[PDB]
Every structure is written in structure tokens, then in C-alpha cells.
Amino acid sequence: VLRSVNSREPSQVIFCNRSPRVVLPVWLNFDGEPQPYPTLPPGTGRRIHSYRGHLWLFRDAGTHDGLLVNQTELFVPSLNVDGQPIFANITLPVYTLKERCLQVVRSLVKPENYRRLDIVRSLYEDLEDHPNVQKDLERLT
Amino acid sequence: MYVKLISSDGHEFIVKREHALTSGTIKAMLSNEVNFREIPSHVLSKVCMYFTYKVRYTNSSTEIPEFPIAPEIALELLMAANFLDC
Amino acid sequence: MDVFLMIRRHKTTIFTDAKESSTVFELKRIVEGILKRPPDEQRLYKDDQLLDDGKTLGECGFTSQTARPQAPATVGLAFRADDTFEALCIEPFSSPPELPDVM
Numbered sequence: 384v385l386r387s388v389n390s391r392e393p394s395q396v397i398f399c400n401r402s403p404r405v406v407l408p409v410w411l412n413f414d415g416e417p418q419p420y421p422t423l424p425p426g427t428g429r430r431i432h433s434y435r436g437h438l439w440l441f442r443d444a445g446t447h448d449g450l451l452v453n454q455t456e457l458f459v460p461s462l463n464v465d466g467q468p469i470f471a472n473i474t475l476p477v478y479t480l481k482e483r484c485l486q487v488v489r490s491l492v493k494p495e496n497y498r499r500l501d502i503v504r505s506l507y508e509d510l511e512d513h514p515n516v517q518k519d520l521e522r523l524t
Numbered sequence: 525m526y527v528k529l530i531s532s533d534g535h536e537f538i539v540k541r542e543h544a545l546t547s548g549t550i551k552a553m554l555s556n557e558v559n560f561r562e563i564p565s566h567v568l569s570k571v572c573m574y575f576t577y578k579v580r581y582t583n584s585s586t587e588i589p590e591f592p593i594a595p596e597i598a599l600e601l602l603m604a605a606n607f608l609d610c
Numbered sequence: 611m612d613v614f615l616m617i618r619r620h621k622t623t624i625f626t627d628a629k630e631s632s633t634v635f636e637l638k639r640i641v642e643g644i645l646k647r648p649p650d651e652q653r654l655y656k657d658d659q660l661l662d663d664g665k666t667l668g669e670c671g672f673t674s675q676t677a678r679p680q681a682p683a684t685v686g687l688a689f690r691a692d693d694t695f696e697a698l699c700i701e702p703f704s705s706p707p708e709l710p711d712v713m
């Protein structure tokens with residue numbers, strides 16, 4: 384369902400990373416498979432060649448935390464008007480406090496030691512349930 | 525309009541009602557003071573700071589900064605956020 | 611430009627915002643509405659410094675980029691009990707435990 388259209392109509396795009404994270408851009412190819420591309424450091428940008436109707440989403444390259452692009456999940460390059468590239472503003476969402484706490488705990492404790500932490504059983508499963516591109520694609524679909 | 529959120533160690537935090545209603549748990553606890561017996565003040569102060577942060581940056585075009593959390597308070601803050609559903 | 615504050619006395623802590631251009635006296639009017647004590651029975655402090663009513667919060671060092679939503683600036687508060695003002699006193703928050711072995 385979520386797949387790039389094979390339009391063959393070039394569309395130049397500026398990936399603008401306005402987040403403090405290292406960004407992993409992911410191209411959903413014609414069979415709907417996530418295809419990773421080279422990372423962007425925090426605050427940097429790149430001019431990239433894509434195509435009209437192609438699907439892109441963006442993540443934290445280390446933890447796969449979800450990021451927004453122009454205030455949304457998905458970015459689809461549009462027609463270029465007067466030779467101007469499309470701007471893809473990559474930003475942090477407003478994470479829930481809970482998820483933000485899970486992010487920080489994950490980043491300090493190695494997966495092996497989640498069960499060693501002194502917390503209720505249900506938070507153990509919340510920690511192990513890492514952000515994942517395949518999982519989100521099943522949600523969106 | 526304001527409400528009082530009281531930590532386990534007696535600290536009384538006064539925040540706006542609409543900020544506090546971010547938490548569905550607090551909405552229920554109100555329906556104008558709320559005593560939290562498991563949340564110490566160093567956690568509850570951070571919870572209040574988050575409310576201000578969420579209300580400010582939700583549906584905002586201005587670049588959003590990371591919400592900071594110290595390593596020392598993360599576990600306790602996780603437990604509170606989980607309970608408060610925020 | 612909005613600034614974000616914690617107005618703190620004893621074990622009380624008010625979370626609110628104000629304009630950088632607003633006055634110390636106007637902040638006292640906000641406190642009055644919440645804690646039911648008029649401006650003349652209040653002293654506001656930045657750290658150990660007493661704040662003048664007619665000065666703006668910007669002049670007193672509360673700026674939008676330092677007094678942030680996620681990390682608000684502290685403004686000391688002291689009440690006048692009858693004739694004389696109490697000394698400024700802010701109870702500190704609780705201390706977090708030691709970082710567990712795994713963190």
C-alpha cells in the first residue's frame with residue numbers, strides 16, 4: 384500500500400535537518416520496502432535528487448525514533464515550481480513525556496539489563512518495544 | 525485558572541488548569557488540589573515543566589528543542605509519566 | 611517575547627509566563643491573583659537580589675532564551691507578616707537516588 388510511484392519525473396529536494404539528532408532518511412521503494420540513505424548530522428542539510436510521488440520518512444539514525452518532516456510522517460516530493468527545490472524540514476516531534484523517558488533509559492541501559500531495572504513488569508515490555516520502521520508502516524497501513 | 529499539584533514530600537506546585545489537563549489521570553483526579561504520594565518534588569517539578577513545554581510547542585512551526593531529562597531522574601520520571609499518561 | 615518562570619517561596623512553586631517587557635509589579639499582580647496577597651506584602655528576588663517594581667523582567671535578566679518553557683527561571687518570593695518582611699527562604703526539591711549499577 385505505502386510505496387513510491389514510479390513516475391520518472393525528477394524532483395530536487397533539500398533535506399534540512401532542524402533536529403538535534405543524526406537523521407536517517409528512508410525511501411519507501413516500489414515494493415514498499417524501506418531503503419536507508421546516508422545520514423545527516425544535526426543542523427546540516429543536503430540537496431538531493433528524488434522523483435515526484437516518491438515516499439520518504441525520517442528517523443534518528445541510532446535509535447530509530449520517529450521524526451517529523453514538514454509537520455508530518457511522510458514526505459512526497461511535489462512538482463518543482465520555477466526551478467526551485469522543495470524544502471523538507473526535518474524536526475523533532477513533541478514526544479510524550481513517557482516516550483521521552485523511554486528514549487533516555489534506552490540510551491543509558493543496554494538491552495540485556497532492562498530486567499535488572501527496578502520498575503514494574505509493564506515498563507519492561509515498553510522499553511523492549513523499540514521504535515521500528517516496519518512496525519510503523521503496519522500502523523500507517 | 526490554576527490548580528495545585530502536591531508532591532509526596534509536601535511541595536505544592538501551582539500550574540494552569542489547562543496545562544494540568546494534559547494528563548488524563550489528573551483530569552479524572554480533579555473531576556482543585558491533587559496529592560501525589562509516589563511522586564517526589566524533583567519528579568513533579570519536571571512534570572510541570574513538560575506541561576509548559578507541550579502547550580508551547582504543540583502545533584508550532586518554530587523549531588522544537590529537545591525536552592531535557594537528567595539520567596538521575598529518568599526512571600522515576602518514567603514511572604510518573606506512565607501513571608499520569610502524558 | 612514570553613518568558614517562563616517558577617515563582618518560589620518556602621514549599622510553594624508557581625509556574626507561569628509573562629512578557630519580557632512586563633514589570634516586576636505586574637508579576638506581583640499575578641501572584642496576588644493566585645496566593646491572595648497584595649503587591650505591597652510581597653518581595654520578589656532574582657537569587658539574593660531584591661527586584662524594583664517598575665523594572666521590566668528583561669532588565670532583571672529574565673529573557674526568552676534563558677527563561678524557557680522546558681527549563682524556566684526562578685523568581686524568589688517573600689511575604690510580609692504584619693509589620694516586617696520574612697527572610698527569603700526556598701525549600702529545595704527532593705534529591706534523586708544514586709544511579710543504579712546499570713545506568
Ligand SMILES: Cc1cc(CNC(=O)[C@@H]2C[C@@H](O)CN2C(=O)CC(C)(C)C)ccc1-c1cncs1
Nearest residue numbers: 398408410420421422423429431432433434437
Ligand atoms: C546519496 C544520495 C543519492 C541519491 C540518489 N537518488 C536516488 O537514489 C533517488 C532517491 C529516491 O527517489 C530513489 N532514487 C532513484 O534514483 C531511483 C532508484 C533508487 C534508482 C530506483 C539521493 C539522495 C542521497 C542522499 C544523500 N544524503 C542523504 S540521502
